[PDB]
Write an enzyme that holds these catalytic residues in place. Sequence first.
Site, PDB file in Angstrom:
ATOM      1  N   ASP A  35       0.791  -1.235   0.000  1.00 49.81           N
ATOM      2  CA  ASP A  35       0.000   0.000   0.000  1.00 49.81           C
ATOM      3  C   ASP A  35       0.831   1.297   0.000  1.00 49.81           C
ATOM      4  O   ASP A  35       2.047   1.237  -0.125  1.00 49.81           O
ATOM      5  CB  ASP A  35      -1.073   0.028   1.114  1.00 49.81           C
ATOM      6  CG  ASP A  35      -0.520  -0.064   2.518  1.00 49.81           C
ATOM      7  OD1 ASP A  35       0.647   0.321   2.783  1.00 49.81           O
ATOM      8  OD2 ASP A  35      -1.308  -0.495   3.389  1.00 49.81           O
TER       9      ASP A  35
HETATM   10 ZN   LIG Z   1      -0.518  -0.369   5.191  1.00 52.23          ZN
END
Ligand SMILES: [Zn+2]
Length: 77
Positions: A35
């Site tokens: 992410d």
């Molecule tokens: Zn994360």
Amino acid sequence: STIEERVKKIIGEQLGVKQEEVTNNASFVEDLGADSLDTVELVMALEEEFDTEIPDEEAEKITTVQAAIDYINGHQA
Ligand SMILES: [Zn+2]
Ligand SMILES: *P(=O)(O)OCC(C)(C)[C@@H](O)C(=O)NCCC(=O)NCCSC(=O)CCCCCCCCC
Ligand SMILES: [Zn+2]
Ligand SMILES: [Zn+2]
Ligand SMILES: [Zn+2]
Ligand SMILES: [Zn+2]
Ligand SMILES: [Zn+2]
Ligand SMILES: [Zn+2]
């Protein structure tokens, strides 16, 4: 051990992914699920292990495990 082994270990540790999943062709985002924060923390963890500094705009373009290994073989001293 080899650079490939050291780099893959750090990637697996950082991203919480199992070793067998960290192939050379794997993309950090699509395949390994990194992410926004992972991007930053993974870059800094490798910069520290290999005592180097990569420009953020160049790091942003290192998309696969092999591209990361390639950069380290080219810049580590
Ligand atoms: Zn994360
Ligand atoms: P988030 O939504 O705030 O940020 C998400 C996006 C906009 C996708 C950013 O992560 C971004 O800049 N994306 C550009 C495309 C992309 O996915 N690039 C990144 C691939 S992962 C990565 O950057 C990890 C690289 C690790 C290897 C570097 C090691 C070098 C050490 C010397
Ligand atoms: Zn060795
Ligand atoms: Zn070995
Ligand atoms: Zn997994
Ligand atoms: Zn892929
Ligand atoms: Zn940086
Ligand atoms: Zn050194």
